[PDB]
Paper text:
Type III secretion systems (T3SS) are bacterial macromolecular machines that facilitate transport of protein substrates across the bacterial cell envelope. Most building blocks of the virulence associated T3SS or injectisome have a homologue in flagella and one of the most highly conserved parts of the system is a set of transmembrane proteins known collectively as the export apparatus (EA). The FlhA/SctV cytoplasmic domain is known to form a nonameric ring underneath FliPQR-FlhB/SctRSTU, but the full-length FlhA/SctV complex remains poorly characterised. Open and closed states have been described, with the open state being competent for chaperone-substrate complex binding, while the closed state has been proposed to be responsible for binding early substrates.
Out of the identified proteins we chose FlhA from the lateral flagella of Vibrio parahaemolyticus (Vp-FlhA) and SctV from Yersinia enterocolitica (Ye-SctV) for further studies, as both could be produced in large quantities at high purity using the gentle detergent LMNG. Particle classification revealed that Ye-SctV had formed a dimer of nonamers and we imposed D9 symmetry for 3D refinement, resulting in a 3.7 Å reconstruction of the cytoplasmic domain double nonamer. The Ye-SctV cytoplasmic domain 18-mer is made up of two nonamers dimerising via the cytoplasm facing side of the cytoplasmic domain. This assembly is not consistent with the known localisation of SctV in the injectisome and is therefore considered to be an artefact of the removing the complex from the constraint of the membrane. No high-resolution features of the transmembrane domain could be discerned. A striking feature of both structures is the N-terminal density of the cytoplasmic domain, formed by FlhAL/SctVL, which reaches out to bind to the adjacent protomer, demonstrating this well studied interaction for the first time in the context of the full-length protein in both flagellar and injectisome T3SS. In both of our structures a hydrophobic residue, Trp350 in Vp-FlhA and Phe367 in Ye-SctV, sticks into a hydrophobic groove on the neighbouring subunit. Comparison of our structures with FlhA from S. Typhimurium, St-FlhA, in the open state and Sf-SctV, which is in the closed state shows that both of our complexes are in the open state, with Ye-SctV being the first example of an SctV homologue in the open state. The demonstration of the open state opens up the possibility that SctV binds to substrate-chaperone complexes in an analogous manner to that described for FlhA, in which chaperones bind between Sub-Domain(SD)4 and SD2 and are sterically unable to access the binding site in the closed state. While molecular dynamics simulations suggested that E. coli SctV does not easily switch between open and closed state, our SctV and the C. pneumoniae SctV structure show that SctV can exist in the open state.
Author numbering:
A (entry chain D), B (entry chain E): 361 to 704
């Protein structure tokens, strides 16, 4: 036992589902239904995701499954599709109009109710959302990555991109590395994928990295200049229609209250107004935006560039699916259709 | 005798149990029951523990055993299971309701009373905690490491991690070594494992090492920023339930008395208020927290980040099993359920 300790590396991503399916589930693909949603999610965000280890554990129950990032279960579940109970995401009284018996739960994103596989034939005629045992699993996965993609872009992973691109763009990389150190360039790539912006376009992120890495030095400013280099991308991510975008402009009185609380002190530049002012603004927002749960068409808040960040991490608690843009990121020839200006 | 001195290295960890078992104990494993609890404890903390030498000494009695860190017995014991008296940890009047004769002691952590091996058959029916001759030994071991894990992470042991990780994360390490010297990076890894935080996740400790090792320079601040990188880990170590955490918030009046006594002088930043104020605060704590011996569910104190340390080493005498958190380490989506605010 005198062997010293034999260090063992932690696993980057891990899926632990129960036993009793290690050969029973195992048959849609569950080795080509993960690698499919990992690639299909890579081409969306661009993060070089890690290898998903798949372990069928017997220690848990029979419908349990936990998805552990680095040995801390981040989205566990007891799939009561355990035997076969293919769930329903947009479950409603329509599943009472389509009367097949239900099973209650609040599986995360939409109201989940479960029906059996004889009931499936008739409800698939009725056309609602069906999640097989693959699609119930990967969905949380494709939701775990999209929300924890700030943790897979580390100094070891960008140096993977800046090596994989050596062939294509030689003199671009040998120029960017001398201007922005790897720590600083990575502290940006995390800040893009935080707003669900896609790294994928890795060239025009380095063009705008070289251009501004000499003039600007505060990361939060530099990333607002770099988003402004993906102009005609964002116009396509948020406003899919004919150059019309449903916005929620901030009336100038507020964009000035926030620009006066930046506190550029210790490379944090924290927005520090007051625990009593934050609730004042966050109320004026909640008073106009409402809840946006019924509000369709995915609106976006639109605020000046230099505070586009601090507004984002402010309402990040209440309004999570409300992206924030800038005036600059808005490529011209976009018809902002203001839903309602946020007064004070 | 002219041989100069022939230097002989001290042993890192050493178990000295008596003779008369060197072949009699020797049969559960006692070479695979230590290496099992050493590995099982490594995957918990992450420290690369040393090799446990096992020596059966005759110089002692017949039920004695001492566990010596570097030749100073740190947890000795005369196991009065000497012949066979498998102990009981949660001994109570239930062992008078289950009337089998007892043997009194205060073996450390829970009330230890001993019963024989014919009594074992019936009390194992009654379902209380049994410690065989292995489990009485390793338990102190798995308690010695967990409490002296600040002594196994030295500059020689982190350079073992930063070499074992060269393969996986090359450019991460070649970046962190130039930012934080080995002394400074190790003075952190000791400060994590001091709070029972787990080094194990060695990547996101280096990501947050690179990020903050340039801005912050006081170790105690840097480690409070590094704990804030293991956010969604701590949420799982202290609040296992559904995002609900039983806290003991500090009312703001106190968190300001302590922030005024930091004395950042000689890289010690000692909290120096008064031997008469420390008893004032430590009384207001003891007046609300009580004793927490009956208080179940493992509550945690929750104080602002910048003094999370000085509060910890303050109550470290009285309330040892009361972990202290920050507001920052608390990942959002955690329902702090304040048990009672510590007023002044």
């Amino acid at each position: 036992l005198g062997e010293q300790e034999a260090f063992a590396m932690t696993v980057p991503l891990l899926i632990d589902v129960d036993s009793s399916q290690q050969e029973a589930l195992e048959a849609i693909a569950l080795n080509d239904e993960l690698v499919r949603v990992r690639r299909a999610l890579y081409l969306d965000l661009g993060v070089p995701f890690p290898g998903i280890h798949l372990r069928f554990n017997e220690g848990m129950g029979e419908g349990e499954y936990l998805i552990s990032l680095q040995e801390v279960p981040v989205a566990r579940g007891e799939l009561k599709a355990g035997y076969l109970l293919v769930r329903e995401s947009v479950s409603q009284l329509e599943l009472l109009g389509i009367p097949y018996e239900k099973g209650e739960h609040l599986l995360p994103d939409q109201e989940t109710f479960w029906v059996s596989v004889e009931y499936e034939e008739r409800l698939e005629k009725s056309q609602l959302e069906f999640f097989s045992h693959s699609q119930v699993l990967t969905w949380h996965l494709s939701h775990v990555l999209r929300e924890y993609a700030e943790d897979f872009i580390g100094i070891q992973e960008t140096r993977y991109l800046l090596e994989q691109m050596e062939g294509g763009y030689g003199e671009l990389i040998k120029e960017v590395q001398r201007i922005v150190p790897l720590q600083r360039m990575t502290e940006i790539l995390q800040r893009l994928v935080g707003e669900d912006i896609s790294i994928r376009n890795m060239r025009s992120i380095l063009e705008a990295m070289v251009e501004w890495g000499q003039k600007e030095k505060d990361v939060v400013q530099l990333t607002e200049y770099i988003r402004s280099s993906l102009k005609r991308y964002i116009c396509y991510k948020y406003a899919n229609g004919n150059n019309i975008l449903p916005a929620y402009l901030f009336d100038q009185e507020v964009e000035e209250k926030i620009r006066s609380g930046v506190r550029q002190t210790s490379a944090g530049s924290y927005l520090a107004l007051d625990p009593a002012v934050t609730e004042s603004l966050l109320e004026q927002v909640r008073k106009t935006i409402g809840d946006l749960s019924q509000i369709q068409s995915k609106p976006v808040l639109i605020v000046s560039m230099d505070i586009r960040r601090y507004v984002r991490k402010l309402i990040e608690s209440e309004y999570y699916g409300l992206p924030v843009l800038s005036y600059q990121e808005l490529t011209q020839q976009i018809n902002i259709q203001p839903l309602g200006r946020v007064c004070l």
